[PDB]
From a paper:
Two glycosyltransferases (GTases), SdgB and SdgA, are responsible for the glycosylation of S. aureus SDR proteins such as ClfA and ClfB. SdgB first appends N-acetyl­glucosamine (GlcNAc) moieties onto serine residues (O-glycosylation) within the SDR domain using uridine diphos­phate N-acetylglucosamine (UDP-GlcNAc) as a donor substrate. The subsequent addition of GlcNAc to the glycoproteins is catalyzed by the second enzyme, SdgA, yielding glycosylated SDR proteins in which each SD repeat is decorated with GlcNAc disaccharide moieties. The glycosylation of SDR proteins mediated by SdgA and SdgB protects SDR proteins from degradation by host proteases, thereby circumventing innate immune attack.
Despite the biological significance of these two glycosyltransferases involved in pathogenicity and avoidance of the host innate immune response, their structures and the molecular basis of their activity have not been investigated. This study reports the crystal structures of SdgB and SdgA from S. aureus as well as multiple structures of SdgB in complex with its substrates (for example UDP, N-acetylglucosamine or SDR peptides), products (glycosylated SDR peptides) or phosphate ions. Altogether, the extensive snapshots of SdgB complexes in multiple states provided a mechanistic insight into how SdgB recognizes and glycosylates the clustered serine residues in the SDR proteins.
Numbering used by the authors:
A (entry chain A): 1 to 496
B (entry chain B): 1 to 309, 312 to 496
């Protein structure tokens, strides 16, 4: 059995999350057992996983100990008619919210919070004593059951939390003490195997959990090396783990030798004999990493993404309009303001031009402030993150990358697969490998926005080029075919 | 020859403008000659019309007297260099514009303005005197020639206008005086037929033109009645004309008998004996009109739009996409849809509203999308011409106006498989939707009932598909083949 350890799955999948799911779906078709391992406590991971993996494709560490691994949504529960009818409480609704303030004949007891406006998903319930101190907080799983009560001290500070199984029995206790104005774990009690276990640390908890999962002949893959690498350090070398690096390994990629390893990858690079091999996406990163490592341990390049059969429309280009697209999380590294800029000085040459920006991150409001400032309301669109962008690649003329650091770009390959050429700064890793300028898009010089504007403008001018590039896009998309990676993954696993 | 008579075509086609082109394409297929007439001076008309009808398909009255009827673009002319290389002027380019100031050795002469940044289309040239007053503006046709010079007075006020043919010769003159604070024609001179004609307003010119155009057994349709009815009224009964009505005919739809006509239509109704008939779109409007006019003249219903044979109903599971194909004008009540989405976003976090159109409320509507934080959900997509791919992942169409004839936007939805949820307004929705067949009719302005239904259909994808299948069915009742029959019928019998 092959385990791909990560942290968790977001509402919106991140690059690492998407990459993990891809490995899982390749291993599915290949015929090898595989499973995702998630470490982070997350009561919404069932909902978050549902449109991508099945509850048997994944083990979550907390679920495991909560005897709630492979548990489904149970039947919905009318909490409000419980409180009114059964409990003879009265329910003052809080305005502009799915919240409530529960009372028993003018005694304030708890503050209820739901996720949804149908009031079917209870999120949390907060408990108050005689003097309206917030004493205890009950958090609920998205499948129904009460998952964790938390006990508060002083200024709603976390003193400890208790994790339960869906039947209610306690399975986990965590004790907090406040260092630097923030709760740090200091004790963990785990009820497991009809015994009691003690750990000082969530890492020590992580290691224990692995040792349970592990059988002889099982193989691990460490994908959030921030957390997963410390966990594996406290694991016997007898247990094979292969590191998977999900981005550029160093703080400045221009200083190949005189540059520190990233805070996230430091723990792996310190214990490099722990890991059976290390996997990057780009050949360049394979070369770069094994020189800096000094070939102490093998390195392989297996790309995080692959190209699949296209049974939606490709290059159905309305000859009157020009859709440009960004498919990138709205974070600073992606440098999306440069694209709003580009669209600014480009409407006058191509009016009726559109830029659709697919993502959602933190820069949402900063990005929206510019499309508004420059008058670009009817030309630039902040389309929220959505999967199955296949319909959304159909009318796309070009893809833009203006990030500065990317590693393998899943959205880059996804463009090429839909026949949409991409114009991207010439950065590491990824674009260099996936784009050949004047083959399937163009590589632009870093942050050289005038060079950017020129080629984007040139390509909008001569559609004969877009069609030529769009062709070779499909060509390049094929070198990363699902078969190329099933085999490439099968060969890697056998060698190990 | 059948002549459909409107004002002109805009950069974004209006409902009537779309209708005149639809009628043309219909006649063109069925083989009866027809061609659009446009009245107002519009020096971008040939560019506006490039995608919809030929230059053989249309006669603009200014083009006609300007002897530029059926004229096409010239070879490019390099004005920038001509002013430099041949007129030894300097060009002080104006910042953030396609404009130059034109000097002759520190003497400020002209302010040029180009449309495009490629400087290939000269738009207008402003002329200044020795004191730097703007005395003359030179308006250029997008085909390259000088169409009109306007002489200014006082506070850049329009005093008279001269209209040329492409050779340069002068063909019309208009003299203005200011009523309120706007210019108003008071004299028109026309050099046509090697003679001089005098008219007192643009209406009398319009009537003079018609008679120039008219030949025995030509037939005319009046499609912009605020302007065209006054024209045909100054025209002899011997010229056949048929009124065509494009909105509700009455200031208030609720008093069928009592209320006044819309200002647009007063001129028409007050002289109903001049028109061989009225065309309307919906069977209902045919009746309501007939009652009021006491069957004085024939009323006939011939829908403004037809359906025809591109991906359809390729619905992504995770996202719900709502569409409004409607102008950003106030009587479409498009703010109500932003309010809808605002309520509906916490039940449907993946929802979108794409709002296709142009219009005066682009700013009111933009502010609300900003105020409510719906910038990631409601989009002002602005006017798009071919919408065939936007309809593909459309879940439903939305209508929230209060006044409509046939909705061409509604039928287009139904044609592309997209059910419509509309208020129960006259005319059009009553006729094209059958609730729980291809969409729902809502009590007018019942924004709760609207929300209730929109959320419902979203809740039941299986209903949506049932509704989509009925929308395709109803659309084939308004087919192309059938409307060519309706036109050929109701031309032959007039």
């Amino acid at each position: 059995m092959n385990y791909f350890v990560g942290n968790s799955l977001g509402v919106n999948l991140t690059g690492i999350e998407k990459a993990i799911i891809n490995r899982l779906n390749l291993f599915k078709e290949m015929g090898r057992p595989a499973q995702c391992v998630f470490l982070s406590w997350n009561r919404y991971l069932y909902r978050n996983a549902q449109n991508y993996i099945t509850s048997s494709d994944y083990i979550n560490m907390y679920d495991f100990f909560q005897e709630a691994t492979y548990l489904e949504r149970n039947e919905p529960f009318d909490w409000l008619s419980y409180w009114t009818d059964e409990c003879h409480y009265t329910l003052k609704h809080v305005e502009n919210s799915h919240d409530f303030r529960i009372y028993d004949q003018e005694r304030f007891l708890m503050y209820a919070h739901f996720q949804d406006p149908k009031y079917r998903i209870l999120d949390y319930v907060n408990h108050f004593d005689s003097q309206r101190r917030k004493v205890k907080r009950d958090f609920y799983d998205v499948r129904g059951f009460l998952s964790c009560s938390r006990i508060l001290v002083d200024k709603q500070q976390t003193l400890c939390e208790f994790f339960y199984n869906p039947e209610g029995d306690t399975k986990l206790e965590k004790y907090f003490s406040y260092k630097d104005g923030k709760p740090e774990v200091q004790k963990i009690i785990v009820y497991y195997a009809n015994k009691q276990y003690f750990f000082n640390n969530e890492t020590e908890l992580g290691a224990f959990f692995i040792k349970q999962l592990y059988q002889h002949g099982d193989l691990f893959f460490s994908d959030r090396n921030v957390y997963t690498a410390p966990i594996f350090n406290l694991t016997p070398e007898s247990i094979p783990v292969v590191a998977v690096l999900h981005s550029t390994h160093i703080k400045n990629i221009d200083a190949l030798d005189s540059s520190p390893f990233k805070n996230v990858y430091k723990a792996m690079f310190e214990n490099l004999s722990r890991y059976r091999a290390i996997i990057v996406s780009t050949e360049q990163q394979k070369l770069d990493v094994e020189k800096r490592i000094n070939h102490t341990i093998p390195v392989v390049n297996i790309p995080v993404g692959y190209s699949e059969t296209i049974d939606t429309p490709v290059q159905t280009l309305d000859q009157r309009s020009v859709k440009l697209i960004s498919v990138a999380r709205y974070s600073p590294e992606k440098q999306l303001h440069q694209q709003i800029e580009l669209i600014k000085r480009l409407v006058s040459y191509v009016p009726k031009i559109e830029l659709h920006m697919y993502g959602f991150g933190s820069e949402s409001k900063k990005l929206n402030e510019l499309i508004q400032k420059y008058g670009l309301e009817n030309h630039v669109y902040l389309r929220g993150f959505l999967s199955n962008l296949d319909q959304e690649y159909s009318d796309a003329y070009l893809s833009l990358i203006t990030s500065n650091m990317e590693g393998f770009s899943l959205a880059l390959l996804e463009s090429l697969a839909h026949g949409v050429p991409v114009i991207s700064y010439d950065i590491k890793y990824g674009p260099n490998e996936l784009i050949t300028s004047d083959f399937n898009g163009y590589l632009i010089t870093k942050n050289d926005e005038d060079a950017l504007f020129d080629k984007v403008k040139y390509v909008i001018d001569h559609p004969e080029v877009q069609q030529r590039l769009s062709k070779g896009s499909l060509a390049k998309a094929q070198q990363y075919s699902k078969a190329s990676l099933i085999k490439q993954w099968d060969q890697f696993v056998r060698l190990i």
